[PDB]
C-alpha cells in the first residue's frame, strides 16, 4: 500500500468535517407590526334651523 | 481501531444535522399558483357512420 494516499484522504475528511462545523444559523428579521401614524376626525355637513 | 475509524460516520451525521438546521430556520415564503387552464384535449380518428 501507498502511504501517501491515506494522509491525503485523512486531510480531506478532516478539512470537510471542520468546514461543516463552523457555519452558524442566525437571522435578524423584524416583526409583522405596523407604525400607526397620527390621524384626525372630520365632520360631515349639517343643517340647522329653529 | 480507534477514534480515527469513526470519521466517515461523523461526517454523515454532521451533514444530516446541517441539512436539518439549515431548513428549520429558513423562512416560509409561499408562491402564487399560476398557469392553470384546460389544455388536455385528446385527438384521434372519428367514427363516421356509413349508410
Question: How would you explain this protein's 3D organization?
Answer:
- This is part of a larger assembly, with two copies of chain A.
- By secondary structure, chain A is mostly helical.
- In chain A, 36% of the residues lie in helices and 0% in strands.
- Chain A contains one helix and no strands.
- The longest helix of chain A has 18 residues.
- Chains A and B meet through helix 1 of A and helix 1 of B.
Question: Gist?
Answer:
Chain A: This is VP3. The structure is cut from a larger assembly and holds two copies of chain A. Chain A has 50 residues and is an all-alpha fold.
Secondary structure layout:
This is part of a larger assembly, with two copies of chain A.
Chain A: H1 3-20
Order of helices and strands of chain A: H
User: What's the number of helices of chain A?
Assistant: 1
* Helicity level of chain A: 25-40%
* End-to-end gap of chain A: 116 Å
Could you tell me the strand content of chain A as a percent range?
under 5%
Structural class of chain A: mainly alpha
State Rg of chain A: 35 Å
Largest sheet of chain A: none
**Largest contact between chains:** A-B, 11 and 12 residues
User: What overall geometry of chain A do the principal axes of the alpha carbons give?
Assistant: rod-shaped
Oligomer: part of a larger assembly
State the total count of DSSP E strands of chain A: 0
Protein name (chain A): VP3
Organism (chain A): Scylla serrata reovirus SZ-2007
